[PDB]
């Protein structure tokens, strides 16, 4: 239902945020 | 109640944050 | 209730942060 | 209760985040 | 119990993020 | 619960963002 769906969407977004943070860290190192 | 809605908004905002981190990473590369 | 509203406020803050970091990216890129 | 106190802490942190985002926007605008 | 603790952790981390946005703002000014 | 879990994960992500942004701040000063 609605809450389960929203929690799954938040979990996807957290994964995207972590991936993006790694891209920034890489760019900073470069 | 409104918990699921709040989590949907939070997931959407976190996606926007992730995209900004990706844009910063690319900006450091020109 | 109050929990959901505070999470909506947290989402609004991360949305604002995303926007400001996107502007920072545009300024760094030049 | 503990939840109410925690929401209070999050509200304080939101207010600090908001002022720092204002400062970042001020640094960017100029 | 665990939700109030998670919210307190989230407040702490938002304050760290505010500190970092201030540092960005200052760095933009040299 | 699942919610406390996800919010702890978000706090960790905001702490990592704060670290990266402080490194960006130093990079913006050369």
Numbering used by the authors:
A (entry chain A), B (entry chain B), C (entry chain C), D (entry chain D), E (entry chain E), F (entry chain F): 1 to 30
Wording from the paper:
CCs are quaternary structures comprising two or more α-helices supercoiled around each other with cyclic (Cn) or dihedral (Dn) symmetry. Here, we describe variants with all combinations of the aliphatic residues, Ile, Leu and Val, at a and d to give four classes of peptide: the ββ class, with a and d = Ile or Val; Lβ, a = Leu and d = Ile or Val; βL, a = Ile or Val and d = Leu; and LL, a = d = Leu. Peptides are named systematically appending the one-letter code for the amino acids at the a and d sites to “CC-Type2-“; e.g., CC-Hept becomes CC-Type2-LI. In summary, solution-phase data and X-ray crystal structures demonstrate conclusively that different classes of Type-2 coiled-coil (CC) peptides—i.e., based on abcdefg repeats with predominantly hydrophobic residues at a, d, e and g—adopt a range of distinct states.
To explore this switch between assembling open α-helical barrels and collapsed CCs, we tested if examples of some of the latter could be opened by introducing polar residues into the hydrophobic repeats of βL and LL sequences. Specifically, we mutated the centremost Leu at d (position 17) to Glu to give CC-Type2-IL-Sg-L17E and CC-Type2-LL-L17E. However, unlike the parents, they had accessible thermal unfolding transitions. Both transitions were pH dependent with stabilities increasing sharply below pH 6–7. Neither of the L17E peptides bound DPH, but both sequestered its cationic derivative trimethyl-ammonium DPH (TMA-DPH) with μM affinities suggesting that the barrel states are accessible. Surprisingly, the X-ray crystal structure of CC-Type2-LL-L17E overlaid almost perfectly with that for the parent CC-Type2-LL; i.e., all six Glu-17 side chains are completely buried within the core of the assembly. The experimental and computational data correlated well: For CC-Type2-LL-L17E, at pH 3–6 experimentally the peptide was highly thermally stable, and simulations showed a mixed population of singly and doubly charged states; from pH 6–7 the thermal stability of the peptide decreased, and the main charge states were (Glu-17)62- and (Glu-17)63-; and above pH 8, both the α-helicity and the thermal stability decreased dramatically, and more than half of the Glu residues were deprotonated. Thus, CC-Type2-LL-L17E appears to tolerate two buried charged Glu residues, but above this number severely destabilises the structure. The macroscopic pKa for the transition from two to three buried charges was calculated as 6.8, which is > 2 pH units above free Glu and considered highly perturbed.
